[PDB]
């Protein structure tokens, strides 16, 4: 028996005129992931908002009787313990994308009998892996200040060649070798890095290690000390919040490059900025911030190395490329259909928490994980 | 025993590193560091004059080239060896490029100068560096990085504004014009990105084994290739048949909203035609590091041209082949070529020669009859 007259609340980013001009912007308040007719034809209701941060936000009002809440990491409705305690009807929290750390998952497990938190696993992992390799190259090859010199009408090859290196012969390490981290290594293979390294408590198979040509390092600090480039590709959970602080960054090589497309809160922003300021890091880049939207005065918008380069920051966009949005929009529909049909026939890999327990190994090494 | 040549006048035209080249000694290809050649030459009894002053009427270059026996140039700051200048270079026997691409020499005039001068370059020295730069530039354009970074530095936040022109490289068709040392290395780096297809156009094909190893397909007609690609990268030398190749007519054969990358030479494109294609949205993006002439004039149109959304420009100064890792290799290669000449052996690597003994010594500067490949 299908569930009936279900209230769905979606918190998405505002596409303004862009989302009218470019209909491929599915993940916007304008286009609503292409869900509205599909839901309404079944007798369900959909409320969509981008208003999610202020006291008495539309989000705060609507979450009190939503049965399904759709969020998206690029404009995250933070499902705090306080909000979940007020979400009296909530059964399913769907992430339109990947990374459900904007939900208090421990509170979700104690809410309304244990809510299901699902995301579209695999939907945008290629998009992010491409973004990582791009960002690595932009930082290593000193692109940003070089492009700024050209647009300013200047010409000084030595000024920007003095901090320009090749990625060939450099050691690159990934923190996390899941769907993104493995795909990063697969794209780096053709660049003839000296070594490709990873750190993860969930290792690659020996066959994948040989196919890609990479090596597992058992200790994070020992990996950092060997790398020229470090890329962060793990989820945000209690043990990764503030992991990259001044003490851990100090284990990276002087003049190294750090890339973070995972989550902003995995780094300590003031520690990254200080490392750049003194030249301990040559560069930092990526697309993720805490909180989002990034405050207008966030220090990593403008932090530079001592040469006035080393910043390859963008807004949170890598996982919301036009190609990615088509995939996560289709995946949200599939998850919604699992719930609304009354089958509850979720793909196991889509579940983060379910029936009062963690349903993943990827949010830290836990006891009391129930894989369905 | 062969007798070494004696008291040879070497002229080097290199870029000025200012304070940078004192701070960072790895800037070898500068007037400050002289490719690490000075002691090595002087200990043999040779002389070295080095300058960056190469463009103005009565430049140091113009004065010194009249009795230089060896002229070292570098593409990043090219001493243009015009027919007029070569006619005045009465002692010139060897022109060495510190890097790759010798189109800043009039090679037809070089073949008629002093019985045919040797023009050599450091083949392979910075091909990896450039191929990396191409893949970086493709990703920067496809993923709309530049306006996104600008939004952040300005204190703004609007994901839709920059995601609306953000694509993945996965599933796109990429084609290279030229599948030589750089073009092949571009395709090798693109392999892991799961492009829909990798294409090339070159009258010198890859072996069938390499086509299958990389996973790429030869297209027999350039316009046929362009019409199939989402991304086009130019990786061929500048010669008569590639000067102005990418004009309005050829660019019109590319797909609407395509991305064009040029790390080869600026004069292979018609800059006004690229700018117009970008401005009308026929190109989504143009990027690379090469310009004509160099240094690029301060008002060069491709410094500031944008697509209709205010993005699509990934231009940098001529730097990809002069990364710190590249400079170590081409500096060592220039020394090797100089030693072949100065030793009196003339035992050049064949692949380093562009013209030699009055004939083209390469197949890469157009399909020619009267090519004499040494060996
Ligand atoms: N910038 C963007 O738009 C996007 C960012 N993401 C972020 O990237 C994360 C990873 O995504 P996937 O690779 O698809 O997830 P995944 O679940 O396939 O892989 C994550 C890996 O991280 C590992 N990990 C967990 N804690 C770790 C630690 N302390 N040290 C090293 N490894 C650890 C897990 O064991 C797992 O193998 C997401 O959770 C999300 O936060 C994902 C997609 C979009
Ligand atoms: N941006 C930078 O710093 C650098 C740029 N370059 C430029 O890249 C060029 C290529 O370098 P490599 O690949 O090392 O040379 P290469 O000689 O190995 O390969 C060039 C290829 O282009 C092909 N070609 C010639 N005319 C063509 C046409 N009309 N259509 C298609 N293919 C054509 C040749 O047949 C040859 O296979 C250099 O000649 C130089 O102009 C090279 C190094 C540094």
Task: Please provide the DSSP assignment of B18-33 as one string.
Answer: TTHHHH-TT-TTBTTT
Whole-angstrom Cα distance, residue A185 to residue B168? 17
Going from N- to C-terminal start, the domains of chain B cover 9-124+323-360, 127-321
Calculate how far, in angstroms, residue B180's C-alpha sits from the geometric centre of ligand 2: 6
A131–B136 C-beta distance less than 8 A: no
Please list, in sequence order, all residues whose beta carbon lies within 8 angstroms of the beta carbon of residue A22, skipping any fewer than 6 positions away. Answer: A15, A322, B164
d(CA A284, CA A230): 10
> What is the chain B residue with the closest CA to A74?
B159
As given in the structure block, the two tokens for residue A372 are 């369905």
Query: Are the beta carbons of A324 and A124 closer than 8 angstroms?
Result: yes
Nearest to A166 by CA among B264, B178, B233, B328: B328
Cα–Cα nearest to B185, from B133, B140, B221:
B133
Closest C-alpha to B302, from B319, B277, B327: B277
**CATH architecture group of domain B127-321:** 3-Layer(aba) Sandwich (3.40)
Enumerate the H helices of chain A as residue ranges.
Answer: 18-21, 36-40, 58-62, 81-86, 105-109, 125-140, 143-151, 157-161, 179-188, 206-212, 220-224, 246-249, 269-278, 322-340
Instruction: Decide: helix, strand or coil at residue A13.
Output: strand
Distance A231 CA to ligand 1 centre (A): 11
Residues of B known to be catalytic: 126, 265, 294, 318
Domain B9-124+323-360 falls under CATH 3.40.50.720: yes
With 0-12 / 13-18 / 19 or more C-beta atoms within 10 angstroms meaning exposed / middle / buried, residue A205 is exposed
| Nearest chain B CA: its distance from A333 CA (Å) | 21
Extract the tokens encoding A157.
Answer: 């090859």
- Give the number of the atom of ligand 1 that is nearest the alpha carbon of residue A182: 13
Whole-angstrom Cα distance, residue B103 to residue B75? 9
In whole angstroms, how far apart are CA B8 and each of B43, B48, B64?
12, 9, 13
Q: How many residues does chain B have?
A: 375
Provide the total of helices (H) and of strands (E) in chain A, helices listed first.
14, 14
Q: Under a CB-based contact definition with an 8 Å cutoff, are residues B151 and B310 in contact?
A: no
- Which residues lie closer than 8 Å to A241 by C-beta, 6 or more apart? A265, A266
Indicate which residue's Cα is closest to atom 14 of ligand 2: B181
In whole angstroms, what is the distance from residue A92 CA to residue A355 CA? 11
Secondary structure letter of residue A164 according to DSSP: -
CATH code linked to domain A7-123+321-358: 3.40.50.720
Token digits for B185?
Answer: 């290395």
Tokens of B150: 């600008």
Cβ–Cβ < 8 Å for A25, A325: yes
In contact, A99 and A119? CB cutoff 8 Å: yes
**CB neighbour list of residue B2: distance below 8 Å, 6 or more residues apart:** B343, B344, B345
Q: Which of B186, B237, B368 to mutate to test the pocket of ligand 2 (most atoms within 8 A of CB)?
A: B237
**Angstrom distance (rounded) from CA A49 to CA B142:** 29
Cβ A46 vs Cβ A31: under 8 Å: no
For residues B218 and B205, the answer to whether their CB atoms sit within 8 Å is yes
* Residue A42 DSSP one-character state: T
Inter-residue contact B121 to B175 (CB < 8 Å): no
Residue B171 CB contacts under 8 Å (≥ 6 apart), including other chains: A323, B194, B195, B196
Give the whole-angstrom CA distance, residue B336 versus residue B354: 16
Q: Does A126 touch chain B (CB under 8 A)?
A: yes
- Cβ distance A162 to B23 less than 8 Å, yes or no, reads yes
Under a CB-based contact definition with an 8 Å cutoff, are residues A46 and A38 in contact?
A: no
CA distances from A282 to A136, A141, A197 (A): 11, 11, 20
Q: In sequence order, what are the residues at sequence separation of 6 or more whose Cβ sits closer than 8 angstroms to the Cβ of residue B333?
A: B122, B125, B352
Token digits of residue A160: 């920007």
For residue B230, the distance in angstroms to the closest alpha carbon of chain A comes to: 14
Distance CA B145, CA A93 (A): 31
Show the tokens assigned to A207.
Answer: 């066959």
A246 touches chain B (CB under 8 A): no
Task: Please give the structure tokens belonging to residue A2.
Answer: 């299908």
Write the class of the CATH domain A125-319.
Answer: alpha beta
Label residue A74 exposed, middle or buried (CB < 10 Å: 0-12, 13-18, 19+).
buried
Closest CA to B52 of B316, B295, B328: B295
In angstroms, the CA B175 to CA B198 distance is 6
Distance, in Å, from the CA atom of B306 to the CA atom of B266, rounded to the nearest integer, reads 17
Q: How far is it, in rounded angstroms, from Cα A200 to Cα A218?
A: 8
- Burial of A238 (C-beta count, 10 Å sphere; 0-12/13-18/19+): exposed
CA-derived radius of gyration, chain A: 21
Q: Residue A357: which H helix or E strand, with range? A: strand A357-358
The enclosing H or E element of A231 equals strand A229-232
Estimate to the nearest angstrom the gap between the alpha carbon of B283 and the chain centroid. 22
- Rounded to an integer, what distance in angstroms lies between the CA atom of residue B275 and that of residue B285? 10
CA B9 to CA B170: how far, in whole Å? Answer: 53
- Max Cα separation, chain A? 71
Which runs of E-coded beta strand occur in chain B? 9-13, 47-51, 70-73, 94-97, 118-121, 173-177, 197-201, 217-218, 231-234, 258-262, 283-288, 313-315, 353-356, 359-360
Quote the CA–CA distance of A67 and A80 in Å, as a whole number. 16
Chain B residue closest in CA terms to A311:
B149
Question: Closest residue (by CA) to atom 35 of ligand 1?
Answer: A362
Pairing of strands A215-216, A195-199: parallel
Cα distances (Å, whole numbers) of residue A156 to A159, A343, A359, A360: 5, 64, 55, 52
Residues with CB under 6 A from ligand 2: B 99-101, 126-127, 130, 177-183, 201-204, 235-238, 241-242, 263-265, 289-290, 320-321, 364, 366
Residues in chain B within 8 Å Cβ distance of A147: 146, 313-316
A69 CB less than 6 Å from ligand 1? Answer: no
Residue A167's nearest CA partner among A212, A127, A128, A132 is A132
What three-state secondary structure class fits B80? Answer: coil
Instruction: Indicate if A125-319 has the same CATH topology as A7-123+321-358.
Output: yes
């Amino acid at each position: 028996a299908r569930l009936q007259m279900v209230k769905v609340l979606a918190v998405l980013y505002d596409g303004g005129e862009h989302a009218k001009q470019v209909p491929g912007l599915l993940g916007t308040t304008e286009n609503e992931l292409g869900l509205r007719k599909w839901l309404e034809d079944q007798g369900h209701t959909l409320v969509t908002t981008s208003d999610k941060d202020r006291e008495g936000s539309t989000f705060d009002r609507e979450l009190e009787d939503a049965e399904i809440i759709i969020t998206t990491p690029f404009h995250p409705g933070y499902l705090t313990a306080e909000r979940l305690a007020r979400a009296k009807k909530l059964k399913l929290a769907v992430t339109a994308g990947i990374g459900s750390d904007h939900v208090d998952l421990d509170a979700a497990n104690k809410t309304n009998g244990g809510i299901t938190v699902a995301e579209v696993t695999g939907s945008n992992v290629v998009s992010v892996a491409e973004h990582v390799v791009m960002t690595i190259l932009v930082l290593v090859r000193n692109f940003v200040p070089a492009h700024e010199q050209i647009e300013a009408g200047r010409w000084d090859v030595a000024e920007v060649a003095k901090d320009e290196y090749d990625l060939e012969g450099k050691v690159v390490g990934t923190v996390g070798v899941g769907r993104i981290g493995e795909r990063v290594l697969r794209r780096l293979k053709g660049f003839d890095c000296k070594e490709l390294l990873y750190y993860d408590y969930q290792p690659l198979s020996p066959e994948k290690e040989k196919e890609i040509g990479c090596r597992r390092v058992e200790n994070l600090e020992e990996m950092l000390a060997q790398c020229d480039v470090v890329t962060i590709n793990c989820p945000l959970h209690e043990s990764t919040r503030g992991l990259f602080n001044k003490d851990l960054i100090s284990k990276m090589k002087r003049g190294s490059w750090l890339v973070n497309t995972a989550r902003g809160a995995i780094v300590v922003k003031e520690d990254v900025a200080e490392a750049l300021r003194t030249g301990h890091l040559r560069g930092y880049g990526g697309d993720v911030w805490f909180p989002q939207p990034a405050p207008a005065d966030h220090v990593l918008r403008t932090a530079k190395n001592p040469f006035g380069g080393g910043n390859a920051m963008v807004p949170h966009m890598s996982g919301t490329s036009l190609d990615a949005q088509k995939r996560y929009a289709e995946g949200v529909k599939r998850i919604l259909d699992s719930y609304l049909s009354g089958r509850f026939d979720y793909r196991p890999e889509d579940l983060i928490v379910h029936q009062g327990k963690y349903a993943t190994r990827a949010y830290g090494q836990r006891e009391d994980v129930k894989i369905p």
